[PDB]
Swiss-Prot record, chain B:
Active site: 17, 258
Annotated family: Belongs to the peptidase C19 family.
Species whose genome carries this gene: Homo sapiens (Human)
Places the protein is found: Nucleus; Cytoplasm; Nucleus, PML body; Chromosome
Disease connection: Hao-Fountain syndrome: An autosomal dominant neurodevelopmental disorder characterized by global developmental delay, varying degrees of intellectual disability, autism spectrum disorder, poor or absent speech, and mild facial dysmorphism. Most patients develop seizures. Additional variable features include hypotonia, hypogonadism in males, and ocular anomalies.
Residue window of the full protein shown: 207 to 553 of 1102
Induction per the UniProt record: Up-regulated in regulatory T-cells (Treg). Down-regulated during neural progenitor cell differentiation.
Domain USP: 8-311
Lineage of the species this protein comes from: Eukaryota, Metazoa, Chordata, Craniata, Vertebrata
Post-translational modification: Isoform 1: Phosphorylated. Isoform 2: Not phosphorylated.
Descriptive protein name: Ubiquitin carboxyl-terminal hydrolase 7
Gene name linked to the record: USP7
Subunit structure: Monomer. Homodimer. Part of a complex with DAXX, MDM2, RASSF1 and USP7. Part of a complex with DAXX, MDM2 and USP7. Interacts with MDM2; the interaction is independent of p53/TP53. Interacts with DAXX; the interaction is direct and independent of MDM2 and p53/TP53. Component of a complex composed of KMT2E/MLL5 (isoform 3), OGT (isoform 1) and USP7; the complex stabilizes KMT2E/MLL5, preventing KMT2E/MLL5 ubiquitination and proteasomal-mediated degradation. Interacts (via MATH domain) with KMT2E/MLL5 isoform 3. Interacts with OGT isoform 1.
Described purpose of this protein according to its UniProt entry: Hydrolase that deubiquitinates target proteins such as ARMC5, FOXO4, DEPTOR, KAT5, p53/TP53, MDM2, ERCC6, DNMT1, UHRF1, PTEN, KMT2E/MLL5 and DAXX. Together with DAXX, prevents MDM2 self-ubiquitination and enhances the E3 ligase activity of MDM2 towards p53/TP53, thereby promoting p53/TP53 ubiquitination and proteasomal degradation. Deubiquitinates p53/TP53, preventing degradation of p53/TP53, and enhances p53/TP53-dependent transcription regulation, cell growth repression and apoptosis. (Microbial infection) Contributes to the overall stabilization and trans-activation capability of the herpesvirus 1 trans-acting transcriptional protein ICP0/VMW110 during HSV-1 infection.
Top-rank lineage group of the source organism: Eukaryota
Tissue: Expressed in neural progenitor cells (at protein level). Widely expressed. Overexpressed in prostate cancer.
Domain notes: The C-terminus plays a role in its oligomerization.
């Protein structure tokens, strides 16, 4: 642990992106502190997902040996390779963050999950020839960006908010106005302090009747200005984002190699987390080397998920955690477990 | 205006002597402020509950741009008259306040925050010279009263504090079975807390007037204070190096004099003067050297209490506080309060 100050997670079976996600959440310090505050007193140790996350986080913060997850995987039910093949990374994030948000209801940290992670967008449909429009505001906790045909994150976001035509056979059913020509789009109302972006790195290919991986080059910046994708900017807080984590997949399949790059303090000092092995790495190894190979090389290593933190919130999100942020009760609970196990 | 410094004052409401000085001192003990916010003040009465009254003063100190009142707070613990404050020393009011919140933090996630911040351990011994008898008393302490008359500075006070006293001749020690014996009395520090409260003995009983008088002698205190040599056993993993945080000052010879506090709230050596409702930036010299007290050649303005913070604990003790550290429940309760009188 002393190489970097950070401890790894055991490779325990094939859980694909799990270890990567767990480190990403662990180093969302404000989330971690909120999780320690959950009132898991009466919870049963084997079935409680909130306690199990407390346990993983406690061990990540204090253990100098790699940390196990078997109680965690048992607690939310994904104990086989199939569970991870049949879910996307953001679905596992939703499973975990939903559990702890519900456990935080009625406590001092209620609402921590929404405040850190959920933004607001509006999706619209506008009829060209008649006076009819439909608006639906929608909350989101992650964004799935299209990469195929796009060179970088900015072009992905341009694509995401682009106006789409519904004419010809596409025509919009406008109800009492009949079939109409219209343009459909989405706009961002807000962006959250912690921004979870998944890249669409598998696409359904009819040729094989199965999904294949997209290995194309796709660039993302260390610093991400997003003000121009809001509907209305705030001069008092520009939507400037800072890269926190790069979740990486090497290979073409669920048998590939999953790792995560983080700079946990947000200072641009990066480490690579490869299950039990954590090592310091260059910024290039974390960012540019995970852009993905371009056509010429004749490279299946590339990012599928990025975490950005709003500039204006970085010091709050990444605020230091001391072991006095872990309640004595929980400390004793987990330390009792260690004594039972070691004998 | 609060924008001068970012800090707001407390109203001068009658003669509460050192109270406003001590409230700012505690408010800028950030780790303690956050714990106080975490207290479960659901069902207590606003005019009866001291823990709720402290939350409310702290909440207003953190959010209001007008000076903050204290009548609800003084009413909740009973000191409504100048006599109430005249009869107690500063550390007694501190003890009253910290006792209330610590009791209220039992069973909660922040249980024990008060001892962790403020309590040290000392051992007091009497050792018989000529017979085999020794009496040892371990004791907790939350504050230290330092003698200043005849001492030039804090180091000489601490030298005095731990100096061995001879019990012989007419002040021989009653050693019980061993009769009257000659012995040596002393004190040793086992631990020093992260937040160190030092009262200077600036009032001494004088036989000439048969009453207490203020001692206005020069007594120097440093910005950095190494204390390792006063520990019975030192720790090479954490030296007892302390950083000056606050200087509580008195002007006059009288409880009718002027009470102010100087703080550098962030511990970065940028000082402000807190003069009830008026907070202003000041130089380091006005906070420290100007409060040493007039050297005889010539001043009744001087420090009576200093707060030091252990070097190794500064970033934890002074960890920044956002409004996310205040539970939404409590915010609503205090905002309902404010609307009722606003109308
Ligand atoms: C289109 N799209 N692509 C996505 C994607 O990649 N991710 C990352 C992973 O969830 C999935 C891929 N792994 C790596 C990986 C494993 C095995 C193979 C493989 N096995 C056989 O062949 N190939 C290939 C790969 Cl890249 C990392 C985690 C997440 N969401 C994606 C979406 C999507 C878009 C909209 C919605 C509705 N809002 C829901 C989902
Ligand atoms: C000896 N000793 N001195 C102390 C002291 O100064 N403080 C600071 C104050 O509590 C007291 C002084 N005021 C300012 C002040 C007000 C009025 C007059 C005045 N008016 C007319 O005459 N004099 C003069 C002044 Cl300086 C500020 C707060 C606290 N504890 C002190 C002790 C002490 C030592 C051991 C124990 C047992 N552990 C208990 C107490």
């Amino acid at each position: 642990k002393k190489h970097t100050g950070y401890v790894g997670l055991k490779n325990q079976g094939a859980t694909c992106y799990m270890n990567s996600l767990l480190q990403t959440l662990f180093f969302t310090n404000q989330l971690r502190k909120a999780v320690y505050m959950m009132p898991t007193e009466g919870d049963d140790s084997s079935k409680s997902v909130p306690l199990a996350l407390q346990r993983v986080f406690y061990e990540l913060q204090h253990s100098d040996k790699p940390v196990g997850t078997k109680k965690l995987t048992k607690s939310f039910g994904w104990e086989t390779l199939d569970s991870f093949m049949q879910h996307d990374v953001q679905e596992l994030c939703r499973v975990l963050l939903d559990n702890v948000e519900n456990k935080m209801k009625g406590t001092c940290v209620e609402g921590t999950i929404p405040k850190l992670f959920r933004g607001k967008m509006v999706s619209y449909i506008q009829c060209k020839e008649v006076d009819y429009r439909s608006d639906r505001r929608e909350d989101y906790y992650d964004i799935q960006l299209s990469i195929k045909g796009k060179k970088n994150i900015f072009e992905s976001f341009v694509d995401y908010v682009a106006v789409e035509q519904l004419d010809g056979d596409n025509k919009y059913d406008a109800g009492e106005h009949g079939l109409q020509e219209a343009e459909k789009g989405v706009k961002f109302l807000t962006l959250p302090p912690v921004l979870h972006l998944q890249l669409m790195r598998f696409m359904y290919d009819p040729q094989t009747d199965q999904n294949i991986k997209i290995n194309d080059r796709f660039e993302f910046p260390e610093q991400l200005p997003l003000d121009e994708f809001l509907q209305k900017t705030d001069p008092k807080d520009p939507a400037n984002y800072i890269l926190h984590a790069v979740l990486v997949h090497s290979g073409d399949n669920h048998g590939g190699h999953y790792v995560v790059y983080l700079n946990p303090k947000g200072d641009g000092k990066w480490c690579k987390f490869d299950d039990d092995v954590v090592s310091r790495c260059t910024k290039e190894e974390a960012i540019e080397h995970n852009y993905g190979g371009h056509d010429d090389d004749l490279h299946c290593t590339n990012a599928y998920m990025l975490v950005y933190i709003r500039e204006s919130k970085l010091s709050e999100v990444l605020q230091a955690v001391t072991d006095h942020d872990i309640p004595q009760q929980l400390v004793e609970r987990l330390q009792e477990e260690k004594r039972i196990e070691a004998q």
